[PDB]
Amino acid sequence: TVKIWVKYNEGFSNAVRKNVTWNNLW
Amino acid sequence: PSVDIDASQWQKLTQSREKQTTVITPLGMMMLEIQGELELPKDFASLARRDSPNEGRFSEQDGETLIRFGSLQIDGERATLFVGKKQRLLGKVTKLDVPMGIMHFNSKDNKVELVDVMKYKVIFKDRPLPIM
Amino acid sequence: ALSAQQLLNASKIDDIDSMMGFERYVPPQYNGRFDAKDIDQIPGRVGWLTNMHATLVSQQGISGVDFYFLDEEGGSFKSTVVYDPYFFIACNDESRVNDVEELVKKYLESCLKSLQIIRKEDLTMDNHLLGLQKTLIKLSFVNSNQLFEARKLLRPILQDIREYDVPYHVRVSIDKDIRVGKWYKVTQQGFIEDTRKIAFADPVVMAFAIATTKPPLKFPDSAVDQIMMISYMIDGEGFLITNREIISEDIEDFEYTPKPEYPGFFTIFNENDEVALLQRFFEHIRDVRPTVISTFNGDFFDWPFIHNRSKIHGLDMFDEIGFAPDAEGEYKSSYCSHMDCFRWVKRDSYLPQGSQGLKAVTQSKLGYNPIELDPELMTPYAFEKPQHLSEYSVSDAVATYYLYMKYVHPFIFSLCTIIPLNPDETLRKGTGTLCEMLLMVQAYQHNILLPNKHTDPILESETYVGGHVESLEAGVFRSDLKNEFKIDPSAIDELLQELPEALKFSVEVENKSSVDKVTNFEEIKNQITQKLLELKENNIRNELPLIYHVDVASMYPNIMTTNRLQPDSIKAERDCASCDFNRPGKTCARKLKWAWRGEFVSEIVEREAIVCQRENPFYVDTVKSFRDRRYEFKGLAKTWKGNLSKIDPSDKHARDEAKKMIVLYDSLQLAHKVILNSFYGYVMRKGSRWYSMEMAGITCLTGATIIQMARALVERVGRPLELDTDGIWCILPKSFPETYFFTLENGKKLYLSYPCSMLNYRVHQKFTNHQYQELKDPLNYIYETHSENTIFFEVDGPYKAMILPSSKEEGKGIKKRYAVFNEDGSLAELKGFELKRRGELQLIKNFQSDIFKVFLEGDTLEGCYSAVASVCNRWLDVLDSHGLMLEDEDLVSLICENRSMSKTLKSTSITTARRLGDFLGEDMVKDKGLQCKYIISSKPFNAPVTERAIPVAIFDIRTIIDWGYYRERLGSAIQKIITIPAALQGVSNPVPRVEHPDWLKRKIAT
Amino acid sequence: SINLHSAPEYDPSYKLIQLTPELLDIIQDPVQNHQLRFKSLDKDKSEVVLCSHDKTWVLKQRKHSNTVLLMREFVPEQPITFDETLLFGLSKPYMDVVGFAKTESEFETRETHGELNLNSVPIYNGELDFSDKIMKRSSTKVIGTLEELLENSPCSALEGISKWHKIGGSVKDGVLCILSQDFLFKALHVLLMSAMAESLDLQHLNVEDTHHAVGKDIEDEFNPYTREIIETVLNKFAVQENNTWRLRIPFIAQWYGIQALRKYVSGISMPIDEFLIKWKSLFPPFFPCDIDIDMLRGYHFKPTDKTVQYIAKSTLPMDPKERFKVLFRLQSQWDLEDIKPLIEELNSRGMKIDSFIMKYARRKRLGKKTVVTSR
Ligand code: SF4
């Protein structure tokens, strides 16, 4: 019931840009 | 294949309603970014029922078990998010350099609908503290 | 001896070079006039010089040097200069040189190539300053091996040392005036510098990172582990090679661009196995022909590992791409420099060893936070989540590339343009050796015979005081809290008396202008007079402070040039024996104090030494000239800054070359800054060619005297807080006259900060050398005398707050530690604190980073101390509850303490290491640096101090933890940071579990 | 204050797309016919683009390592009261929001040149009775009108019509087509002969009068120069605008030069003088135009400095080193302006063209010309 929390990431990371396919949307 | 973005409803609502004043748009929207993983229970229907009535920390609304996971208090640009009994997050309301836009892909009818456009975000970049 | 082997190596290197596009270019014969001013007539080819190496060349071999060039036309070539090696013999009896000649005639049965009589200056010899010269025999030889055999032949006689680290390439580069980074037309007569091209050409730049297999919980070991990926970047285009016997899926093409400034489009080469990956890598290198290859700590990890796997698959990397380990175990090629950025990081970045990881350099210098992944999850993910692992690999390669391109490349290449070395050497030598090399250049060009390397035995503790440090007050000081000042009225009296001349000096010396042209002298002078008189009346005052820092611009170099300090000026049992003396009246020689320190019982004795004002100026001329060229580039920088903004905004309109120019002059001025600052430390190094302990003493004592004079003034007019070597942090009363701006006739304004000008005026009153002489007519030995002084305080600030710690010891402060904050609340400097110290709890770092800023809240002393009391009570609630108010997962992560072992196991770390020895084998700890992760547990009770680090990562935890120990640890930190300065500021103990001892009360007026 | 709640199941249809200022201007425009449309050539392989009515952006998803929760405001169906915990700084609840989505990525838009997907579009050479031929072949793909083509193409309407006109697209007997090079220029030649034969205003041409002029004395069943063909030739070799066409005369001369190269001098390196004479003689009488060989730069090469020979850019390799190898095989020493339009296609980095040349081969100058030798 009190088992909700955030596992802190030490630093902000932004991942690599990826191409998008039609299946990526659906 | 190809499909249009339907943005007529959001546009009509935007022109007929005033400019965005606070962090929440007139249609009632907010985003949130956390540097981490929000560790939540894997099940909810079973666990929402054992929560005592006084706490109401796991409520039921229209057949859906919603978890009351925190509270938000906005003091000017400063903002604080209380999570559970043991977490406190300090953050800020920042104006987006690039106005984000939420959309919606209706797979059923192959229709795309513009839901809304953001201009602000509430960010929390520091390690969570106890609620005190 | 190894002649024929060196010829074999030369021919192999020639084959490598030709395969990679460096054919030997031999320019056409041209019988005409070697002239340097006209260039366009002479037949030949213009090229930008990028490397040079000693070599031996065939028609017995002939010594020479290969120079590797790029050109204005996008191509490359190499060309070779030949030069006879030589060294000199000095005789102690000139009259019988013919007998010595006969001796060596016998000693050098076959080694000798030629001989010749020459004359050089010897600065140890009486009357050398009046033109008496030393006669020397120049002895020439075919190669370095013959030199080394000659030295071996001469050593028994000396038993019954000279030129041993004079690199051959250095000797030719100096004598020929050649520098990497400069442009030359290569001709038969030699190299003619093209002064028209200054902007660098653009080399092919390769940066690379490997990902390897390793066993669980151990380090990669190159005898058995394999490469799973190699990522690299070449001039902004990414490549990734994969070993699909191990990486369990094909990686697809992707973009990684962590800032818009840094684009990364990566093309993928999924290769079937390890050998194919190697062949694709080497083949790609051959395809693109890099002349820089960069790594991060590749000399200790990447390269030997690659070598051993290469050998394991029967490939010869030297044969494939020409890289091989040298005698130091470092990886070098002929045609491509290996720029391991870690060397630059360690030497030049100015960062503590705790921040020498890729992460901290990336965040500090490139300004963003890269992706991080635990190695234990990295190996399974190779199979299970290959995209994430591949994101890590390319992030590594991007960071290394842009770190190199933005910082290391301009810096190293600009350093090569004044120092006679190739990039590898300029990267790796001590700063003392670079200084040595510059002075050797200056000496050669002024025909000065170089002294031999000092060899005298090491007065066991020769470790004299280098700088003076004082903690004067501890506490928080803030612009919104009032402080007590006690003004010495006789200081204001001195200031008022000195004021007209102090302002005249400000106008004419500080600003290099003339009082003649000042519009507002009397107005300003009345305004200041009124402020000083007001301060004079109410001289016991309590008001808000001005937090200033004042710091002499380039302290030790300016002390050196002002006092004309150089090693040859030290008397050494004789001066004025043959040169005239009454012209400064004090027999020419200017006596200055240094502090001698013997340790035997320890004793310091003040001593004095004479600095000749007529001695040959080559050292100090290098310093003055170097200082002016750096100032030149700071100026050019500013002009360029104006050019980068004056113009139009079409960024791509042939003005990105101008930005390259900007970057370039930036690099040259910072390169002069670092070389300039290496001149103090050079004079104390072991084996220095210009060793002088006395010179270092003179510099340090002079600076200490200047800075104490400044201390005596500030102490009479304000409150100094902390002093370290060449800097003073102080507070002045708000009523003190501060900043004004004189208006010039052109309408411009000149800035005046009066505390700074009053100090510089006093420095010029007390420490000007009025005896600086210079040859006005060298043929007749006519000297001219004048006054030199380039020592100036400058001011930074005002600041919002300062926080200073106190020692645990009675009547003692802590040196090398303080915190200072800018007006906006940001951190300007942190020295000494646990963040920097080996071994600390991340929680404590998070604590200190929280607490420092909270002293700027509140409007009163009591309110600020109440606020820190409240945070103390917050921490007491977390610690008094033994961690119960805390999730079980967040705590265990947070338990790491990190410690470097500076040596090998063969301290608290040591026992852990020993136990690590027991656990993972002693070979694991045969090298330094294993995983030293520990917590101090309450149990077992009575364990020894050296047992305190227990390996715990292997492991009711809340009852295991010794919370009282950590509260004591926090108490210790709190003692240093909060409670003891509070006590010194008369505030009673906000953390009662650490009690105020009696002595600290006694310390203050109580 | 607002109470934050979370549902057990999020809708993954909601995704975040970055909106640049220009996108915002586009978004707030009710005037547009088509506002925005996601387009892709296929479902599994090709890239996805976002198109407005006149511009095209390619989409790129960018993953991030954070937890991003979007909350929408909701009105609880039944009054709900929450207990107070040791929480400080709490105002009375006035509305309620629920995190309904958890997004891990954004969709960035980068401007790119829209191109037509000409997969199933056949080539028309002016064959008689072509309707029969479209069933002589088995083309399942149907394209009745051009709007349907544009709808299924990754481009905007204006880009589509411009590219379609540029490649000489047409429609014959109700079937969409692409004209062959030969028959298109032949139709141009006959049209110009008829236009100057009837002294028409070449700057104010309309479809009807020219179409009538071309097919005046030929049978309709065997007259392929239909009205649609006329619209294509006008939209290809003229500019329209009550909109009329005016001829692009230097462009026509350039096209004509390309035609001459492909028909007559594609196998031998003729001296330039004789080729200019024959070239000049091929035009319809009194056509106003001057000539220089640089108006065919990028379509020819020079075996020696005073001769010319045709080369088609389509036959050149896509590997850089190979294409440069074959270029140097055709000409050891090149003039810079001759080789520049030939290398434009290899790398879009926007650098100085000389740097582009400096990856493999090397430059060497002389008096005015700069040539390139792979050493
Ligand atoms: S002090 Fe002056 S006079 Fe004496 S030796 Fe030196 S230069 Fe000569």
Query: b/e per residue, C665-691, with b = 16+ CB within 10 A?
Result: bbbbbbbbbebbebbbbbbbbeebbbb
Helix, strand, coil shares of chain B, percent, nearest 5, are: 10, 50, 40
Tell whether D135 and D238 lie within a shared domain. yes
Pairing of strands C727-733, C545-552: antiparallel
Domain termination residue (choose one: D111, D146, D170): D111
**Measured distance CA(C112)–CA(C443) in Å, rounded:** 26
Secondary structure (3-state) at C341: helix
What is the spatial distance between Cα C352 and Cα C348, in angstroms, rounded to a whole number? Answer: 11
Does C573 contact chain A (CB < 8 Å)? no
Which residue of D60, D65, D362 is in closest CB contact with C74?
A: D362
> Do residues C214 and C225 touch, judged by C-beta distance below 8 A?
yes
Domain containing D44 equals 2-111
Q: How many domains is chain B built from?
A: 1
Which residues make beta-bridge pairs with C759?
none
- Check whether residue D23 and residue D132 sit in a common domain: no
- Specify the length of chain A in residues: 26
Q: Token pair for residue C427?
A: 């990267």
Distance, in Å, from the CA atom of C37 to the CA atom of C709, rounded to the nearest integer, reads 53
Query: C524 vs C403, C795, D38, CA distance in Å?
Result: 49, 20, 71
- How far apart are alpha carbons C244 and C232 in whole angstroms? 17
D347 → chain C, closest CA residue: C237
User: Domain for residue D116, yes or no?
Assistant: no
Distance CA C972, CA C982 (A): 14
End-to-end alpha-carbon separation of chain D, Å?
74
B27 burial level (CB within 10 Å; 0-12, 13-18, 19+): middle
* Inter-residue contact D36 to B7 (CB < 8 Å): yes
Q: Which of D59, D62, D67 sits opposite A15 (nearest CB)?
A: D62
* Cα(C801)–Cα(C852) distance, integer angstroms: 10
Beta strands in chain D (DSSP E): 2-6, 16-18, 37-40, 48-51, 56-74, 95-111, 123-124, 169-172, 175-179, 238-240, 245-247, 270-271, 300-301, 307-310, 362-365, 370-373
Q: Which of C127, C129, C579, C592 to mutate to test the pocket of ligand 1 (most atoms within 8 A of CB)?
A: C579
Same domain, D231 and D278: no
Q: Ligand 1 in contact with C612 (CB < 6 A)?
A: yes
| C913: enclosing H helix or E strand | helix C908-920
Q: After which residues is chain C broken (C to N over 2.5 A)?
A: 59, 160, 458, 600, 906, 955
What residues form DSSP beta bridges with D111? D57
Which of D246, D274, D307 lies at the terminal end of a domain, its last residue? D246
Query: CB–CB of D270/D289 below 8 Å?
Result: no
Which residue is associated with the tokens 């200490």? C704
Return d(Cα D148, Cα D143) in angstroms, integer.
6
b or e along C464-479 (b: 16 or more beta carbons within 10 Å of the residue's beta carbon)?
beebbeebbbbbbbbb
Comparing CA positions, the residue from C314, C347, C328, C310 lying closest to residue C430 is C347
Distance CA C394, CA C242 (A): 12
Kind of pairing between the strands at C205-212 and C292-295: parallel
H-helix or E-strand spanning residue D282: helix D272-282
Contacts of C826 (CB under 8 A, 6+ apart): none
Please confirm whether the linkage preceding C798 is cis (ω < 30° from 0).
Answer: yes
Question: Which long-range contacts (C-beta less than 8 Å, at least 24 apart) are formed by C107-110?
Answer: C107/C153, C107/C154, C108/C139, C108/C150, C108/C153
The rounded distance, in Å, linking the Cα atoms of C587 and C603 is: 31
Q: How far is the CA of C613 from the centre of ligand 1 (A)?
A: 7
CA of C48 to the centre of ligand 1 (A): 46
Q: Give the pair of three-digit tokens for residue C377.
A: 């999850």
For ligand 1, pick from C564, C587, C769 the residue to mutate: most ligand atoms within 8 Å of CB: C587
Token pair 């034969």: residue: D197
Sort D332 into a burial class: Cβ within 10 Å, 0-12 / 13-18 / 19+: exposed
Q: How far apart are the first and last CA of chain A?
A: 35
**DSSP code for C210:** E
C504 CB neighbour count, 10 Å cutoff: 15
* Residue D86 maps to a domain: yes
Tell me the DSSP string of D148-206.
Answer: HHHHTSSS-HHHHHHHHHHTTEEEETTEEEEE-HHHHHHHHHHHHHHHHHTT--TTSB-
Neighbouring residues of B70: CB distance < 8 A, sequence distance ≥ 6 = B81, B82, B83, B84, B87, D4
In a domain, D118, yes or no: no
Q: How is residue C237 written in tokens?
A: 């285009």
Q: For residue C453, what is the DSSP state?
A: P
Q: Contact, C304 vs C222, CB < 8 A?
A: yes
Other beta carbons within 10 angstroms of residue C590's beta carbon come to 19
> Which residue is listed with tokens 């070239």?
D279
> How far is C310 from C226, CA to CA, in rounded Å?
11
Please list the residues that pair with D362 across neighbouring strands.
Answer: D373
Strand C190-193 relative to strand C749-753, pairing: unpaired
| Closest residue to A18, CB basis, from C254, C370, C371 | C254
Q: Which two tokens stand for residue B16?
A: 């007929």
Q: Write down how long chain D is.
A: 375
Residue C840 CB less than 6 A away from ligand 1: no
Tokens of B29: 């929207």
Q: Do residues D238 and D292 both lie within one domain?
A: no
CA nearest B50 in A: which residue?
A1
Other C-beta atoms lying within 10 Å of the C-beta of residue C744: 15
Q: Which of D83, D111, D139 lies at the terminal end of a domain, its last residue? A: D111
Question: Which whole-number Å values give the CA distances from C300 to B129, C11, C237, C394, in the listed order?
Answer: 41, 29, 26, 21
CA distance C899 to C932: 6
Q: Are C318 and C230 in contact (CB under 8 A)?
A: no
- Please indicate, yes or no, whether residues D344 and D287 belong to a single structural domain of this protein: yes
| Residue that the structure tokens 């590898």 belong to | C424
D53 lies in the same domain as D128: no
Domain architecture of chain C: domains with CATH: 1-85+141-201 (no CATH), 205-422 (3.30.420.10), 460-563+597-614+693-799 (no CATH), 838-1003 (1.10.132)
What distance in Å separates the CA atoms of residue D175 and residue C339, rounded to the nearest whole number? 64
Kind of pairing, strands D95-111 and D56-74? antiparallel
Residue C553, phi-psi category: left (phi > 0), alpha (psi -120 to 50), beta (remainder): beta
Q: How close is the Cα of C763 to the center of ligand 1, in Å?
A: 26
For D273, D294, D306, D331, the CA distances from D309, given in Å and listed in that order, are 13, 13, 11, 11
Backbone phi, psi, residue C234, to 5°: -125, 115
Element (H, E) at C978: none
Alpha-carbon distance D98 to nearest alpha carbon in chain B (angstroms): 8
Q: How far is the CA of C571 from the centre of ligand 1 (A)?
A: 9
Buried b or exposed e, range C798-822, using 16+ CB within 10 angstroms: bbbbbbbbbbeeeeebbbebbbbbe
D291 and D217 in a common domain: no
Closest C-alpha among D70, D60, D68 to residue D18: D60
Q: Which residues pair with C267 in a beta bridge?
A: C239
Written as one string, the DSSP assignment of C56-115 is: EE----EEEEEEEEEETTS-EEEEEEE---EEEEE-S-GGGHHHHHHHHHHH-SS---EE
What are residue C236's phi and psi, to 5 degrees?
95, 5
In angstroms, the CA C1000 to CA C808 distance is 9
Q: Does the CA dihedral C859-C865-C870-C871 come out positive or negative? A: positive
C568 lines ligand 1 (CB under 6 A): no
- For chain A positions 1-26, those within 8 Å of chain B (CB to CB) are 1-9, 11-12, 22, 25-26
Helix (H), strand (E) at residue C768: none
How many angstroms separate the CA atoms of C733 and C98, rounded? 77
Token pair recorded at residue D172: 């014959």
* SS3 labels along C524-550: HHHHHHHHHHHHHHCCEEEECEEEEEE
Query: Residue D123 CB: number of other CB atoms within 10 A?
Result: 11
Domain that holds residue B84: 1-132
CA distance C415 to C670: 9
Contact B72 D1 (CB under 8 A): yes
Centre a 10 Å sphere on the Cβ of residue B21 and count the other Cβ atoms it contains.
8
Strands annotated E in A1-26 = 5-8, 14-19
Number of domains in chain D: 3
Do D199 and D276 lie in a common domain? no
Indicate which atom in ligand 1 lies nearest the CA of residue C589. Answer: 1
CB within 8 Å of D279: residues ≥ 6 apart: D256, D257, D260, D291
Phi, psi of C883 (to 5 degrees): 80, 0
User: Is the distance from the beta carbon of residue C589 to the nearest atom of ligand 1 less than 6 Å?
Assistant: yes
Contacts of A15 in chain D (CB under 8 A): 62-65
Six token digits for residue C798: 């005002």
